[PDB]
Symmetry: D2
Subunit: 326 residues, 4 copies
């Protein structure tokens, strides 16, 4: 049977809450061995090893956990046939993309979480973790980058995003769609990501103890320049704009960032809008102000790639090329 | 024929850009008479009156325009059989909700914009404005609150949100769905909003020259408390959290706002997640910290209702009741 | 606590496999009392009683079970505070709509099923049933017609359809959306159906032992007229076209359905297309030929209405009327 | 500039009404040269030439046009840099897939249609055709099989289907998603189909004047076995079940299709359900009875594959093989 490492970093997948019929619970309170023995059917398909990395709620997720994650995956590559990370759903789309860029293992890394806590009636997490292990054990799952397996679906880490607050089917690759579906412990893969991933990137976090500070401002009607101004005062290496429509800013947030761009801050335009590209050659001359268009990458996902781009260069056009490649 | 007032505040619906096959253009550069005479078929269904309110891009939209808007609609109620506001698509979901709460006209107010500029090949705006006028002229459209009519669909202002950056079909009511569809200049309405709207609210902007400052922070991995802290320094009456999953915050953004709640700032939890409620009785004890759960209202939409709630009260539980009613 | 009767018909909610990990199962081999006792949390929210009506896979559902279900609900109406129907998912949309039109009872009738068998890991049916009892218990569910509760979502019988073959979230209201969502045993209803339903209809099945024969024919490239033909020859009372696009016919089906319609068969043009209305005033002169446009009714839903419409009149214009009203 | 041939078949792209405001029209009454000349921006991006193949409404599309189209494309393959097929929207999914399997040509074949007639206000077809010439001109479109370009979106012939009766955005890839999006004449391709296509298939239509007869039968509550029966009796070569749920049959259709399948008719179980696979290993012993599971192929797509599969073998296991591969 395939040697699958489970890496455990928390999430509702490992959270409980008194009544099976109450929505009240705590993230990251259950250990990796409980999870594993809660799904005895893993024994039949994998030689699972549990390792607890942290035990937090992914709302609390951070760079440290990311760096600890890439490292341990990269370091433990050749002692196992695939990895599975149990993770909170709230920021799984970020970690998954982070790992997607920083992991150099060709072998299946798969993230998985659960929208209902383990004490819930009809809890999602057992079958989630089952199918995630299945995915991790499929030969075909190799060389497709970091995966999220949720609700019977294999999603790529680049596009996977959380579309609903509570639905078990919340995870969806909302622009290019999923890679394959899971029936009966078998996957028919029909799609594979075309953007460069895992081993095909230059990113290398091996020797890194922290990441270039990057923050996110939201644009709305009458948007305040105060969030933006704050981040530059504090010397942020990067601001990602959560812009309106095709990545537009408010007048004040525009000027602040237009300045910031001329004074060394990288600025990437993305969109609060849930699907679709932030394009160049629309209403904002990106070359003129030195901005970068985030493409299909929503804000938080743009934040991930900004940080890792920043650890190569500070130049608007080198970054844009990285948004067009990765 | 029905006396329909068009109110013009800008948008791509009134923007152009050299080549019909280039995506480069300027918002708010075309006047209301050009728009009207660009769609001669309005003459057959309405007695249209054009009035230019401003001529901006809705990325630049603000409170002044909102207040000018409600007022003129409320004031001109009884000189016309319905209104239509031409608006940029970027923040139409906000204005539409604003108007939804502040307008006291039972008569059809309908917003409309276009995702392709008027010089574009196969431009959306003609037919958009046609069908919006149709909507404004339908008796059935009365008493359903402020409407967005886009891509052959009548959407309520509360739920209407912009789901795509570029698609002409971007506007969708992503939790409770549309109210009716438009075929052949006729609408079959099947749905009407159940939340209190227009005349059934207490909001009254008649005598108001400004609105309680409210801002939006975004939560992500390793979120900075700097945006939040900034807004409280400056004495904001309200912060809306763009939280992860079911409205969760990062540890730092949590504490800052937990403080802010104890020191007079209203704090409303919403979600960056595009569909679904921010619920109470989930992972965050709202009563304990004095927070308010934004419900199906995304951040920007929560911002609208926070501002207008703030002009009644500063108390967490009176506000929550307004999020549950409106 | 309310009194809630469960009319169990079968399906996968009541199906079984030899495995929680394999997908191979048999529908409706489990009694009603088993379903009730595997969800003892029902006790906190209602006084439940389960009666077995049939125990079939809903792929085999037929006119007799519907006549049984309906009158049984109308008859036993004031012995209970609410009804929950366990039912297979395959034809549930069809039953829901049928009870939607035939149920003269003024109490919540809620349909529920499962996509995973009860033996299956993370089986959806314990919590489905719970949520369906909640919906059927909530006083606010009255006056919304026959209802379907799947994946934390309350759906109207008219729009509800199965959008996916395997996914737990298959059931959606693809045109007008859901009536309400369910969190922590509570429903935030924001919507009600506008087409008249339940007691508002003239359809009285209480003396019928038998429904007009209505069959359905698929259109597609190079369509055979053999099925149309074979239904006319058995003197079916009505035929529904699952047409292409907006109710369009393949030329030999058009000939057969047109002749048949002059000779007294009713024929409805519906569409194989999964969302959107089959409208009038496109490419087919419905009035010329005696055809009825289905509207948003898909073929099998439109068969439900058409059957019930044939019990009132055999007149094309009058069936249009019903098709515009119910 | 590339050389792009346009094989025009008709549809609404080439349809006309008496009005830009009314919805009443006739499909395919406009010549190819008209289409080309109403979009003179084609000049900047290609050397276009339009040949008229037929001028039908695609609701009337049939096996002969497909045989014509296919060989004409294979024959005229190296006279051009690319092909664009104008075509009605109703059966376009069916043609696309057919050319997907039959086109041995190694150049972009792109299908395009319109949902609004050319006379209509904000008609979608000028820009559709433009975008289809872009797609057919882009060198990056090679090696992705026969393609469909609608609403700024490049879709693979296999997954693409018409999800809505009237909306300009009807065409989606409902299972695996789009191949690429189109902005400002440019395509960000992030995906390619994995099922083998075009030259990768053993289907050679180049000497066929005639395709195996394959019909389609709908399942629904109380289904008539009359259509199945009537197709067996005309010695159809194959039958597709538009089943309920995951390929399920109504009992009398099951009997008829099972007997027919032992007697040499091939029968595929597809599904009326608009998304998701008709899988094996659920409720039907496909192997026992000689049935083939369609997978993600919907009935009409599955008829395309089944027809072409009948030209290779009459053997159930071997048609499964094709159904797992193409
Ligand atoms: N707050 C949780 C949500 C979940 O896991 O369901 C998290 O850690 O993301
Ligand atoms: N930036 C534009 C976008 C549009 O109208 O299409 C606006 O004013 O919202
Ligand atoms: N064949 C089953 C499917 C299910 O219930 O999940 C039925 O319709 O009974
Ligand atoms: N009946 C038309 C529909 C369209 O093209 O929009 C066709 O399929 O030809």
């Amino acid at each position: 049977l395939p040697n699958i490492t489970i890496l455990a970093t928390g999430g509702t997948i490992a959270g409980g809450g008194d009544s099976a019929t109450k929505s009240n619970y705590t993230a990251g309170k259950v250990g990796v061995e409980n999870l594993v023995n809660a799904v005895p059917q893993l024994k039949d398909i994998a030689n699972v090893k549990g390792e607890q990395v942290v035990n937090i709620g992914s709302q609390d997720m951070n760079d440290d956990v990311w760096l600890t994650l890439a490292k341990k995956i990269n370091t433990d590559c050749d002692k196992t046939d695939g990895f599975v990370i149990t993770h909170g759903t709230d920021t799984m789309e970020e970690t998954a993309y982070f790992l997607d860029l920083t992991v150099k293992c060709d072998k299946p890394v798969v993230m998985v979480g659960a929208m209902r806590p383990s004490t819930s009636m009809s809890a999602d997490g057992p079958f989630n973790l089952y199918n995630a292990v299945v995915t991790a054990a499929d030969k075909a799952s190799a060389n497709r980058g970091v995966l999220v397996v949720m609700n019977d679906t294999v999603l790529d880490g680049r596009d996977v995003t959380k579309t609903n607050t509570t639905d078990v089917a919340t995870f969806k690759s909302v622009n290019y769609g999923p890679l394959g579906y899971i029936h009966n412990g078998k996957i028919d893969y029909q799609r594979t990501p075309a953007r460069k991933h895992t081993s095909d990137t230059p990113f290398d976090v091996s020797k890194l103890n922290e990441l270039p500070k990057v923050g996110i401002v939201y644009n709305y009607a009458n948007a305040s320049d105060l969030p933006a101004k704050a981040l530059v005062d504090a010397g942020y290496d990067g601001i990602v704009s959560a812009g309106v429509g095709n990545g537009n800013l408010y007048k004040t947030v525009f000027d602040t960032l237009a300045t910031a761009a001329k004074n060394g801050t990288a600025v990437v335009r993305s969109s609060r809008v849930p699907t679709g590209a932030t394009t160049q050659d629309a209403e904002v001359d990106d070359a003129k102000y030195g901005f970068v268009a985030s493409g299909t990458l929503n804000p938080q996902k743009a934040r991930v790639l900004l940080q890792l781009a920043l650890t190569q260069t500070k130049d608007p056009q080198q970054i844009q090329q990285i948004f067009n490649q990765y």
